[PDB]
Amino acid sequence: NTELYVLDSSLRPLPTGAVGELYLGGVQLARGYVGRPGMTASRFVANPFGPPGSRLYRTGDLVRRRADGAVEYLGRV
């Protein structure tokens, strides 16, 4: 169950029409095995918005939110 976030470089949510980076919430990865811990820790980061201990998927993609709340894709950073 994924939530879409549009954040600035300070990890703050952005208003309608502002250009930011897409982060995905509700992410779950395998718990038993982490073969690439550093890359994982840089790609799936602590979530300031979800439940305690949750993580955000840092997509590295540029997006902006429309008036109806939907997300428009603008290309990879």
Partner: protein, 54 residues
Amino acid sequence: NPFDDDEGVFLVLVNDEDQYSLWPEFAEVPQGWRTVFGPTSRAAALDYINTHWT
């Protein structure tokens, strides 16, 4: 992006499930996460995570 910024200053966070997260020091630590290392360079934080997330 702050998580890719080699000029950044970083902390290492862990949650109650022993998962790790890189973190820029300027940002508030989210609930459910505690700091175990830093402030330090990006390379040293990633070194710590590769050392301890085993």
